[PDB]
Design a protein around this nucleic acid. Structure first.
Ligand code: FES
Ligand code: K
Ligand code: K
Ligand code: K
Ligand code: K
Ligand code: K
Ligand code: K
Ligand code: MG
Ligand code: MG
Ligand code: MG
Ligand code: MG
Ligand code: MG
Ligand code: MG
Ligand code: MG
Ligand code: MG
Ligand code: MG
Ligand code: ZN
Lengths: 168, 108, 110, 193, 119
RNA sequence: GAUUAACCUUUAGCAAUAAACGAAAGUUUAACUAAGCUAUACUAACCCCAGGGUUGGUCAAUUUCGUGCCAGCCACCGCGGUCACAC
RNA sequence: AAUAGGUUUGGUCCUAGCCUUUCUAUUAGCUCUUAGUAAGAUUACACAUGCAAGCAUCCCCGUUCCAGUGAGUUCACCCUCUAAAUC
C-alpha cells in the first residue's frame, strides 16, 4: 500500500479539491503553529491536510512554516502592496481556517468562472489542425465535402495526372 | 525506503543496455579467415561447422554456419546475424545462408 | 512599482552576515515531487542589502525586490525583520515570548 | 452453396435448423481461435473466404453460409452488440474476421439509421439561448442607394472610356511596345449559342 | 526565430493532400514557411465544391479586423476572397479579368456566327 | 564516387498557394504544384493468379521413410546412441 | 511489467534471474496482381555536370527568406526594459 498515514493526501484528486485561490496580491503566506497543545490542534491539521491543497492551487506563492516560535498559532500574509494580514487561528478548526482565508483573500466563484471562460476562447471549434490543438485536422473530415484521396480515390477528371495527359 | 529517502534518490536508473556481438545492428559484413569445427558442451556431441571472420568493424569473431554442408573458403564475403548457438560456448554469430558467397543449403 | 527582479517579496532566514551591508538569506519554497505527490522544501540563497547591518544569523527577515540589482548577486533589500533571533514579539498579543511561553503576561497591560 | 434465406435472412434464425445448431446462445459462443501463447493477436484474420476457398477454422459468420449479415436481420446483429452498454464488440471478442466485422459494423449502423435496432438516444440541450430572429443577419437590411437605382456599388466598377489626350500620352510613353486599343467591354457576359 | 524586418500577413496556407487542396487562413510572419508557424488561424477555404455545389469559406471577421488594425498585410488571393464576401471592395483585377473574359467570349461568339453564316 | 546491414528520377510547370520586386499589367522561383521510382505503411479491389513460416512442451497443427549422440536442430526447457510426432 | 505462461530440485515451498505470448520500426532470406494515398542515403565523408534569385525607366529593394542537415548543444519559455520592422 501507499506509505504513510492518510495517503489520500498524495493523490491528484485530493490536491485539486482545494477551494482557496489567492488573489494576485498575495505573495507570501507564513504559518506559525505549535506541535503540542489542545488549542493549536486545528492549526496542526491545517498544516497536515490543507497546506498541500493551498500550494497546489497557488504554485507561485511562497509558503513557509515555523514551529514553536510563539505561544499561539497564527497565519500572516504578505501582499504585493506591502500590506500584512494577520490571522489568529488559535481554537479554530482547520476547516474554519480554510473558510476564513478564502473569504478575506480568496477569489470568489464568479471571478474563477470568468477565467475559465476566457480559456475556452483559445480553442476555436472552427479551426483545423493537429488533434493536440483542434477537433478536426482537415475539411475532408466534414461530411458533404470532398473526402481525402487516401480513403476515396478522386475522379480521374480531378487528378493532375490525367488533366495534363489530356491537355498534353 | 521512506518517502524522504525515495525523494532524495529519485527515480530508478536502468542499467545502460549492453550491445551484443553485432553492436546493436541487424547484420554485419565479414570476410572469412578460416573454417573449422567445434565440439559442443555436454551432453551434446557433434562437430559443428564454424568459421572465423573479420567483421566490417575490424573485430574478429567466430561464427556458426547453419545447415547441412557449406562451401565457404578463406577470403570470401559473408553476412552475419545475431543469435547464439546454444551448445557452442562463445559462438554468438551466425552466417546468413543465401547471401554474398554463402549460398543456400543444397536440397537433400 | 515595476522592477526587473523576479522575486518581489520573499521571507527567509539569515544564514550569513560576513559581507559589508549585505545579509545572506536562505529562502525555502514548497515544491511538489511529481512521482510521490508530496511537497518538499527547496531552498535558495539571496543577498539582501542591509544598510544598517542590523541582521543577525538566525533571524527571519522580509526581503523586497530592488528596482534594478545593485550588484551581481544583490537584487533585494531588507524590508523588515519578522522574527529577531531570541527576541520574538508575539504578533497576536504584542508581548515578548520565549518559544511557546510568554515573558510578559498579556494580562499585564490588560 | 446457395442459401435459401438470402432474400429473407431473418427467417433462418426462426427455423428449426438454427435452434438445433445454436440453441439460445450466440452464434459465436462455441468458437475459439487457434494461436500460440496465452495472449492472442490483436487482430483477427483478414478474411476466412479467400478466392471462394474457406480456411480451416472459419469464423462464426463464415462457417455458416446461411447467416446473412443484413441490416434487416436484426436478431443476428443484436448478438454482436453488448446488451448492457450498447457498444459493438471488437472482432477478437467474438472471433469474426476483419472482413465480416466491417460488414457487421455497417449493417448495425444501417439498422440504427432505419430505426430497426434500438439504441440509446440522449436528451440534448438547445443550441441557442435566445430564439429571436430580429437581428439584421437573419432579417432585412435597408438596401443601399446604388442597389435601389441599379448602379454598381462603386462607380469605378464600370468601364469609363479615358480621354483621347491621356491615351496619346500612353502611346508616347510606350511607343514601340503597344497593343491594340480596347474599347468598352460587352454590357453582359456573352454565351455560346 | 526573429527575422530581419518583415511583418505580419494574412494569407492562405495550403493543406490537404495531392489533388485535394484545402487552405487555412492564417496571420503569420511573411518570412515564415507557407505551411509553418503562424500567429493565429483566421478561417479556412475549401476550393472544391461540396455535395451542395458550394465553396465554403470561413472568416473570423472579428480577428481579421483586429490584425489589420495591428498592421497586418493581405496577400492578393486573400484580398479577392474579402472582395467576394463583400467585406472589401472588389479587387481591381477581379473587375479587369471579368472584362477580359467578356471580350474573349465576345470574339468566340463572333467567330462561331461567322462560321455558321459561311455554312 | 567511396563507405554501410541500410541504395528514389541527372521529370515537367510557374496554372494554384507562398516568397521577391514593380504604381501596375506582370516577371522570377529545383519553395511549391503535378508526375517518375520503391510491399516501408494505410485504404480499396481482383474471372484467372499464394506465398512464407510453423506442426515435442510452453503454443494452433505430422503420415511414411532415411539417418543412428553422426548429419543436424531449439526463443526457453531440450532432441539425435536402430519404433526420432523435435534432424 | 499483464488475466499471465515456461524454466532451479529426487521432491515441496519461498525468493529470483532468464525466456514465451502483445505492438511497432529497420535490415536480411524466400515470395509478390492492380489502384489511390502517405513516407522514403548508413555516413557534418569526397563530389563530375545542369539548374535552384531576381525585379525594375537607371536609384534602390531582394538574394539575411525559403529549401537543407543534426555536427555541436541547457541562446528555445516567462517577466522587466527597449531597438529595428509593419500600421
Ligand atoms: S487529410 Fe484531408 S484531404 Fe487528405
Ligand atoms: K544429446
Ligand atoms: K506560380
Ligand atoms: K519465474
Ligand atoms: K527593385
Ligand atoms: K530550415
Ligand atoms: K545534433
Ligand atoms: Mg537451451
Ligand atoms: Mg531503406
Ligand atoms: Mg524549371
Ligand atoms: Mg510524388
Ligand atoms: Mg527411424
Ligand atoms: Mg521434422
Ligand atoms: Mg529434473
Ligand atoms: Mg549522427
Ligand atoms: Mg521603433
Ligand atoms: Zn470470417
Amino acid at each position: 500500500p501507499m506509505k504513510g498515514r492518510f495517503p489520500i493526501r498524495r493523490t491528484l484528486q485530493y490536491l485539486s479539491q482545494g477551494n482557496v485561490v489567492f488573489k494576485d496580491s498575495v505573495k507570501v503566506m507564513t504559518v506559525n503553529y505549535n506541535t503540542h497543545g489542545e488549542l493549536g490542534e486545528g492549526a496542526r491539521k491545517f498544516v497536515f491536510f490543507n497546506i498541500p491543497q493551498i500550494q497546489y492551487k497557488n504554485p507561485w506563492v511562497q509558503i513557509m512554516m515555523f514551529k514553536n516560535m510563539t505561544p499561539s498559532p497564527f497565519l500572516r500574509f504578505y501582499l504585493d502592496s506591502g500590506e500584512q494580514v494577520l490571522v489568529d487561528v488559535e481554537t479554530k478548526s482547520n476547516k474554519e481556517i480554510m473558510e476564513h482565508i478564502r473569504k478575506i483573500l480568496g477569489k470568489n466563484e464568479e471571478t474563477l468562472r470568468e477565467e475559465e471562460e476566457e480559456k475556452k476562447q483559445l480553442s476555436h471549434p472552427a479551426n483545423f489542425g493537429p488533434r493536440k490543438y483542434c477537433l478536426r485536422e482537415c475539411i475532408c473530415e466534414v461530411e458533404g465535402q470532398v473526402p481525402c484521396p487516401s480513403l476515396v480515390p478522386l475522379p480521374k477528371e480531378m487528378r493532375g495526372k490525367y488533366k495534363a495527359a489530356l491537355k498534353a | 525506503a521512506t518517502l524522504n529517502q525515495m525523494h532524495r534518490l529519485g527515480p530508478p536508473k536502468r542499467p545502460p543496455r549492453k550491445l551484443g556481438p553485432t553492436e546493436g545492428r541487424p547484420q554485419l559484413k565479414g570476410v572469412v579467415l578460416c573454417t573449422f569445427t567445434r565440439k559442443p558442451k555436454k551432453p551434446n556431441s557433434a562437430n559443428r561447422k564454424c568459421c572465423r571472420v573479420r567483421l566490417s568493424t575490424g573485430r574478429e569473431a567466430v561464427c556458426f554456419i547453419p545447415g547441412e554442408g557449406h562451401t565457404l573458403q578463406e577470403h570470401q564475403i559473408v553476412l552475419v546475424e545475431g543469435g547464439r548457438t546454444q551448445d557452442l560456448p562463445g559462438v554468438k554469430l551466425t552466417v546468413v545462408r543465401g547471401k554474398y558467397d554463402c549460398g543456400h543449403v543444397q536440397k537433400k | 512599482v515595476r522592477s526587473s527582479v523576479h522575486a518581489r517579496w520573499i521571507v527567509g532566514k539569515v544564514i550569513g552576515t560576513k559581507m559589508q551591508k549585505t545579509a545572506k538569506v536562505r529562502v525555502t519554497r514548497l515544491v511538489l515531487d511529481p512521482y510521490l505527490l508530496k511537497y518538499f522544501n527547496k531552498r535558495k540563497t539571496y543577498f539582501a542589502h542591509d544598510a544598517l547591518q542590523q541582521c543577525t544569523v538566525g533571524d527571519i527577515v522580509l526581503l523586497r525586490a530592488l528596482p534594478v540589482p545593485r550588484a551581481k548577486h544583490v537584487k533585494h533589500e531588507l524590508a523588515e525583520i519578522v522574527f529577531k533571533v531570541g527576541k520574538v514579539i508575539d504578533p497576536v498579543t504584542g508581548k515578548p515570548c520565549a518559544g511557546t511561553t510568554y515573558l510578559e503576561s498579556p494580562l499585564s497591560s490588560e | 452453396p446457395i442459401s435459401p434465406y438470402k432474400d429473407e435472412p431473418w427467417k433462418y434464425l426462426e427455423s428449426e435448423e438454427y435452434q438445433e445448431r445454436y440453441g439460445s446462445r450466440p452464434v459465436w459462443a462455441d468458437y475459439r481461435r487457434n494461436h500460440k501463447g496465452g495472449v492472442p493477436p490483436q487482430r483477427t484474420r483478414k478474411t476466412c473466404i479467400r478466392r471462394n476457398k474457406v480456411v480451416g477454422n472459419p469464423c462464426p459468420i463464415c462457417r455458416d453460409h446461411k447467416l446473412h449479415v443484413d441490416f434487416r436481420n436484426v436478431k443476428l446483429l443484436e448478438q454482436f452488440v453488448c446488451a448492457h452498454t450498447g457498444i459493438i464488440f471488437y472482432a477478437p471478442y467474438t472471433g469474426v474476421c476483419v472482413k465480416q466485422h466491417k460488414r457487421l459494423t455497417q449493417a448495425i449502423q444501417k439498422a440504427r439509421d432505419h430505426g430497426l435496432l434500438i439504441y440509446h438516444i440522449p436528451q440534448v440541450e438547445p443550441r441557442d439561448l435566445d430564439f429571436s430572429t430580429s437581428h439584421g443577419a437573419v432579417s432585412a437590411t435597408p438596401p443601399a442607394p446604388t442597389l435601389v437605382s441599379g448602379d454598381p456599388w462603386y462607380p469605378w466598377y464600370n468601364w469609363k472610356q479615358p480621354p483621347e489626350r491621356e491615351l496619346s500620352r500612353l502611346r508616347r510613353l510606350y511607343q514601340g511596345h503597344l497593343q491594340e486599343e480596347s474599347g468598352p467591354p460587352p454590357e453582359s457576359m456573352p454565351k455560346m449559342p | 526565430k526573429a527575422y530581419r524586418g518583415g511583418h505580419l500577413t494574412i494569407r492562405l496556407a495550403l493543406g490537404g493532400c495531392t489533388n485535394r487542396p484545402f487552405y487555412r487562413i492564417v496571420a503569420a510572419h511573411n518570412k515564415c514557411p507557407r505551411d509553418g508557424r503562424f500567429v493565429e488561424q483566421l478561417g479556412s477555404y475549401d476550393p472544391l465544391p461540396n455535395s451542395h455545389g458550394e465553396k465554403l469559406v470561413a472568416l473570423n471577421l472579428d480577428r481579421i479586423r483586429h490584425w489589420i488594425g495591428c498592421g497586418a498585410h493581405l496577400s492578393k488571393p486573400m484580398e479577392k476572397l474579402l472582395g467576394l464576401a463583400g467585406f472589401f471592395p472588389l479587387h481591381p483585377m477581379m473587375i479587369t479579368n471579368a472584362e477580359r473574359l467578356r471580350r474573349k467570349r465576345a470574339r468566340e461568339v463572333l467567330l462561331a456566327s461567322q462560321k455558321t453564316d459561311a455554312e
